[PDB]
Amino acid sequence: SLAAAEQWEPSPLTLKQHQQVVVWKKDRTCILCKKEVQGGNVEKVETACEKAWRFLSGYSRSAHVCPILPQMRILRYGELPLRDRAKFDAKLRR
Amino acid sequence: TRYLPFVPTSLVHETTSFLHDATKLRALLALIFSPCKPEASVADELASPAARLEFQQEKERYHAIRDQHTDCYRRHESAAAASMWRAIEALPSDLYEEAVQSVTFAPPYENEPFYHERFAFPRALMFHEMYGEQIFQSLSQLERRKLQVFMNLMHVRYPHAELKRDKPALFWLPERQVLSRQR
Amino acid sequence: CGPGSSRFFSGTSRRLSLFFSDPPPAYALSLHAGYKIQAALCVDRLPLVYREPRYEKRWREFKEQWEAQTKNGLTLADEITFMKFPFHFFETEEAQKKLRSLEREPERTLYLIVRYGDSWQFPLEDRIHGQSMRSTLKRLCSEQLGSSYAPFLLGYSPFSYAKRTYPKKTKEAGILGRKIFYYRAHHIPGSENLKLPEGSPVSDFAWVTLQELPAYISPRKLAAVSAGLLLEE
Amino acid sequence: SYRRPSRASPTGQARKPHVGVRRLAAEYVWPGVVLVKQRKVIAFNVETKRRNRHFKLYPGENVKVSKVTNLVALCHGRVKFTHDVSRDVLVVNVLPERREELLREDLWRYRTEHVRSMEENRHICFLRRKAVRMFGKELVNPPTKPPLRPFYFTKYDSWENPALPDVPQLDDDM
Amino acid sequence: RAFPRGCELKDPA
Amino acid sequence: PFKIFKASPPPAPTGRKPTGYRGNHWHKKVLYDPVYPTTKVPAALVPRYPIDWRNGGRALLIAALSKLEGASALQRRIFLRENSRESQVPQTPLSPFQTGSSASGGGAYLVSSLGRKRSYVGRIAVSLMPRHRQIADYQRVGGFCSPRCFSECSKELRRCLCAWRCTGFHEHVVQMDGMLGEYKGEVKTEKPLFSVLRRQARRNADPSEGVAFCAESAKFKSVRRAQHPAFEAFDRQGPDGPSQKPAPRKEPPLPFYSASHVPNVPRPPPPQPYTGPLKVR
RNA sequence: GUUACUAAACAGGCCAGGCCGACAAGAAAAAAAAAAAAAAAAAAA
RNA sequence: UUCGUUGACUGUGUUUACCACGGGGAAUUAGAACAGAAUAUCAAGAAAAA
RNA sequence: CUUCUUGGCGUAACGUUGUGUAGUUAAA
Ligand code: FES
Ligand code: FES
Structure with a gap:
């Protein structure tokens, strides 16, 4: 109940499901960062782009800090379909 | 005559000096845009891969646990709202009009020249008033500095909070004297 | 569940008027489809001490520590931290180096319950035809609980309603039953407790938590009120 | 000293607006036919005016709105009108049909009718419509000759000339 | 019975 | 004083494109009429005063206050409002994953966000308050406890304590107070709206x-x-x-003669819809 | 089936012939809240 | 969101509402086809026993 | 499982034709 919810101990499986992740809407190049992306690709939020991580975490007041920030779709690992999870498992292992 | 609202510079001298002082303006802007690390070049990093990995892990754990915890409260609130709307529907048509008016109800104002009394929120019911001493005794050093700065900026924004209550007439002037002033 | 007259009281007038109307009241009643309209008040006292979840404290402390390590925290310059106002309190650690009681069970929430004879319920009053439920609640407070007792009302809308049909003999008098609308209220901290006015129908009062509520109030009333009562297990 | 208005003779307005419907009910039309001519300019006290020009009509099924707000057809069919009680306006629809003889027993399909919503307008258009594109229908006396010649060649051509040869009709289902 | 032809059957394949 | 012969403020001048001077662009039709399109006013032509301490410095002060309170508090308040407006009936508990089996969502906000593919970055952008109306609204109901304390905390100097330590049971208290204290009648405005209109309670048939x-x-x-x-x-x-x-007629017959049989306008306008409360089944 | 066009007179008067490379084109998205109170910043996205 | 973008494209096809003619030009159709280039938007994510 | 958008805005729409500038001819 409420007591158990407050005392909840997230299992490593639950933490893995709650892992955040970037899914790329489209292909694009960074103007200043020169990174190359392909639509449907899946990356870790930590290493995908530090400048975008600034805004995603709360240390940037500009939404244009990463030139391709609008092409991001931030989802949790557990929400991804089995196909994508298996396809990109290697790059999401942390 | 008819009057219009106004706030002369004399009664708010403090905030004008605050905002016209260069150093105070710089400090306020730094607080707003903190941290002030550069974000233009590719080599500008305010963190490290490991640092932000640990931050992400902690944030994910926090959000997961908070969602697990507050969900019971959310369900209870949904049930309570259902019951409230059911009761309102059950009320008779005579009492319907009063039963939908919200706490802050007041009859419309008349510019002349179930409502028993004005709405006043007991200050003793505010969360920070009820638990101010305990939270203050449990704060940290940085949190105490934050509270101090929050106070000082609140006062700067509202130097006349008590003066408006005491002498509200000082903030209303005639049209023929208000409209004739440049911006 | 059982409000019967025997279990309620015998030989009194004001108490029985509310629940049976056997001694007819001196004012005009208000019926809705044959059921008398009544307003019920559920005053609550919030916990007197503050509790913080471990995950919240952990996240906050870890954020402060992470910010300290990474040098990404707020600036909070001295020119905006020290400008000599009466409420000033900050000073750097370096410079420092140089069952009827409101205080009962302070870590939980309490609810004011009233004893009408041998029955434990919430304060209740009848609606006189043509007057607001707010006025009915005010009369309830001023005549049953305390002439100076004025708890803060959370709104003009009820948070729940209940129905009760009279037996055959009682309904033969022309009133089919009573329908009750419940309203929440807050006991303003620092305000005086109840002082039952002389002649008030209330026999006694208590301030019980959710856990103790079923020990006093009937399961039917608990079902009627629990949806609106705050959540605390 | 009388100020002669600029629109006095001989410099009056040569061409009048001619605002209103340009096709009546049950008339056959094809994409591009202007069902109703309208203008964007609006009077300065419209709600007090009484002339029928100021109050525009509304597009419905298989009808577009032009740049100047003309209502134009989008499919080969027959015109129908509807009255919107909720908005108190007239709505122009086109029921899609291939060219064929307009019979007396089928005229009821193009009556002006009252509706409350555009959903009900679409429902009524479906109910009165003759047939659907995917199933078609048996055409009753369909035309078989080529169309009328271009206007710039002759303004007064003859419809269904028996001396001309039969040519396939493969455009009125679109 | 015969059926009218679809949009696909009218393109210049 | 508090009681005063208030003057009606002059209307703010809505700008206009310097074109179409011979036409009436102020028909009373509703956006977006298919046959009566409304002329837009570019934001660059709306007259606005030059920025001074009264309009800029005040915004800076309120922004600093919001920074001290933390954007997370604003995000949480917005999320709670959005979830409350949509979860006014008992829902089944919703997990965010097909196989988590232990994780709970925390509200129908999940369903709405998934359906609209709402922008995680967009929520942060909104919480950062880049717009004048957003800052003005924070200056008025910026307090975390607003659903229960309204604008009473708009000038309190220890208000940040709510944002810092109002969680769990206290958030539940705020929500439960707000649900009882909020308005539930008909809203009466002529301005355009495009969001789901707030609920209006149904009214019972019989009187007492x-x-x-x-x-x-x-x-x-x-x-x-x-x-x-x-x-x-x-x-x-x-x-x-x-x-x-x-x-x-409830008034004495007029001594003069008036053509009272004449309707107000030659062509009456269309009937107005009933915006009042509906009945109870 | 189906009622809609239509301002002649030196008749009773109107006219500013112009704006925009974009918060003015514009995909996707978003968008204006009863009464009262607070604030006196002409503020929906 | 403080979100992209430049279709405010290059061409083939003489068919079309209106009608003295001219200015298809108070400002009509996907002439629903064809040859290039570009911009935005995908879809799916079903099954929680006793 | 055909294809979610698109060749401006403009409730004053730019002066037709001509001259001039400019474009096209491994064809017309
Ligand atoms: S992908 Fe290069 S800065 Fe974000
Ligand atoms: S902000 Fe008002 S009591 Fe918390």
Whole structure:
């Protein structure tokens, strides 16, 4: 109940499901960062782009800090379909 | 005559000096845009891969646990709202009009020249008033500095909070004297 | 569940008027489809001490520590931290180096319950035809609980309603039953407790938590009120 | 000293607006036919005016709105009108049909009718419509000759000339 | 019975 | 003082493109009329005063206050409002994953966000308050506890404590107070709206009848007099029948003659929809 | 099936012939809240 | 969101509402086809026993 | 499982034709 919810101990499986992740809407190049992306690709939020991580975490007041920030779709690992999870498992292992 | 609202510079001298002082303006802007690390070049990093990995892990754990915890409260609130709307529907048509008016109800104002009394929120019911001493005794050093700065900026924004209550007439002037002033 | 007259009281007038109307009241009643309209008040006292979840404290402390390590925290310059106002309190650690009681069970929430004879319920009053439920609640407070007792009302809308049909003999008098609308209220901290006015129908009062509520109030009333009562297990 | 208005003779307005419907009910039309001519300019006290020009009509099924707000057809069919009680306006629809003889027993399909919503307008258009594109229908006396010649060649051509040869009709289902 | 032809059957394949 | 002969403020001048001077661009039709499109006013032509301490410095101060309180508090308040407006009936618990089996969502906000593919970055952008109305609204209800304390905390100097340590049971208290304290009647505006309109409570059919006791028969009887049954029906249900004469004149006949039979306009406008409360089934 | 066009007179008067490479084109998205109170910043996205 | 973008494209096809003619030009159709280039938007994510 | 958008805005729409500038001819 409420007591158990407050005392909840997230299992490593639950933490893995709650892992955040970037899914790329489209292909694009960074103007200043020169990174190359392909639509449907899946990356870790930590290493995908530090400048975008600034805004995603709360240390940037500009939404244009990463030139391709609008092409991001931030989802949790557990929400991804089995196909994508298996396809990109290697790059999401942390 | 008819009057219009106004706030002369004399009664708010403090905030004008605050905002016209260069150093105070710089400090306020730094607080707003903190941290002030550069974000233009590719080599500008305010963190490290490991640092932000640990931050992400902690944030994910926090959000997961908070969602697990507050969900019971959310369900209870949904049930309570259902019951409230059911009761309102059950009320008779005579009492319907009063039963939908919200706490802050007041009859419309008349510019002349179930409502028993004005709405006043007991200050003793505010969360920070009820638990101010305990939270203050449990704060940290940085949190105490934050509270101090929050106070000082609140006062700067509202130097006349008590003066408006005491002498509200000082903030209303005639049209023929208000409209004739440049911006 | 059982409000019967025997279990309620015998030989009194004001108490029985509310629940049976056997001694007819001196004012005009208000019926809705044959059921008398009544307003019920559920005053609550919030916990007197503050509790913080471990995950919240952990996240906050870890954020402060992470910010300290990474040098990404707020600036909070001295020119905006020290400008000599009466409420000033900050000073750097370096410079420092140089069952009827409101205080009962302070870590939980309490609810004011009233004893009408041998029955434990919430304060209740009848609606006189043509007057607001707010006025009915005010009369309830001023005549049953305390002439100076004025708890803060959370709104003009009820948070729940209940129905009760009279037996055959009682309904033969022309009133089919009573329908009750419940309203929440807050006991303003620092305000005086109840002082039952002389002649008030209330026999006694208590301030019980959710856990103790079923020990006093009937399961039917608990079902009627629990949806609106705050959540605390 | 009388100020002669600029629109006095001989410099009056040569061409009048001619605002209103340009096709009546049950008339056959094809994409591009202007069902109703309208203008964007609006009077300065419209709600007090009484002339029928100021109050525009509304597009419905298989009808577009032009740049100047003309209502134009989008499919080969027959015109129908509807009255919107909720908005108190007239709505122009086109029921899609291939060219064929307009019979007396089928005229009821193009009556002006009252509706409350555009959903009900679409429902009524479906109910009165003759047939659907995917199933078609048996055409009753369909035309078989080529169309009328271009206007710039002759303004007064003859419809269904028996001396001309039969040519396939493969455009009125679109 | 015969059926009218679809949009696909009218393109210049 | 508090009571004063207030002047009606002059209307703010809505800008206009310097074109179309011969036409009436202020028809009373609703956006976006297919046949009566409304002329747009570019934001670059709306007259706005030059920025000074009254409009800029105040925004800076309120922004600093929000920074101190933390954007997370604003995000949480917005999320709670959005979830409350949509979860006013008992829902089944919702997990965010097909196989988590242990994780709970925290509200129908999840369903809405998944359906709209809402922008995680967009929520942060909104919480950062880049717009004048957003800052003005934070200056008025910026307090975390606003659903229960409204604008009373707009000037309190220890208000940040709510944002810092109002969580769990205290958040539940805020929500439960707000649900009882919020408005539930008809909103009356002529301005455009495009979001799901807030709920308006349904109204019961029957009214309440006053009854007083009569000892002559030892029974309760209605306070109101008898009247004819037809008169009772007219008073209760309405005019009865499909047509009746207009209301009789309540003013003394005018000495002068006026053409009172003439309608107000040659072509009456369309009927207005009923915006009031609906009945209860 | 179906009622809609239509301002002649030196008749009773109107006219500013112009704006925009974009918060003015514009995909996707978003968008204006009853009464009262607070604030006196002409503020929906 | 403080979100992209430049279709405010290059061409083939003489068919079309209106009608003295001219200015298809108070400002009509996907002439629903064809040859290039570009911009935005995908879809799916079903099954929680006793 | 055909294809979610698109060749401006403009309730004053730019002066037709001509001259001039400019474009096209491994064809017309
Ligand atoms: S992908 Fe290069 S800065 Fe974000
Ligand atoms: S902000 Fe008002 S009591 Fe918390």
